[PDB]
Amino acid sequence: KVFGRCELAAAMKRHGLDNYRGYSLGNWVCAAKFESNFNTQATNRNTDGSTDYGILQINSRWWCNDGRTPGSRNLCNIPCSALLSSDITASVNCAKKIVSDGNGMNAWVAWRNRCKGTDVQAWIRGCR
Numbered sequence: 001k002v003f004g005r006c007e008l009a010a011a012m013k014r015h016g017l018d019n020y021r022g023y024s025l026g027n028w029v030c031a032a033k034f035e036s037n038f039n040t041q042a043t044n045r046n047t048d049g050s051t052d053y054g055i056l057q058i059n060s061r062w063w064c065n066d067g068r069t070p071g072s073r074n075l076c077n078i079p080c081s082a083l084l085s086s087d088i089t090a091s092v093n094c095a096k097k098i099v100s101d102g103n104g105m106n107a108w109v110a111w112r113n114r115c116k117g118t119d120v121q122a123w124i125r126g127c128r
């Protein structure tokens with residue numbers, strides 16, 4: 001599913017991301033835009049052989065099991081395919097564990113390079 005901007009903001013807020021660990025809702029929407037273009041089905045292979053899954057491009061090296069990343073961990077204890085469903089619940093709950101691991105939203109390269117330090121509130125401007 002390809003979310004709309006305001007559709008995604010509302011679902012992220014319902015699932016507890018607004019100001020989660022201090023990051024306002026606009027940061028998560030901006031991150032999703034540049035990680036996945038709001039597409040729940042986005043997948044992207046990493047040079048080390050791991051894969052990024054879903055709306056927040058969560059990495060199988062540490063967080064989910066795809067059965068094809070040797071020597072990886074599954075810290076969210078889910079199949080990476082759960083991160084691709086139209087329901088973002090699994091992506092959000094795993095994102096919460098990622099952002100709580102010590103580096104905040106710097107875990108998402110797109111956030112550090114394209115959202116950090118910008119007017120991220122614009123991403124939720126106009127939404128109900």
Ligand SMILES: [K+]
Nearest residue numbers: 022103104105
């Ligand atoms: K932080």
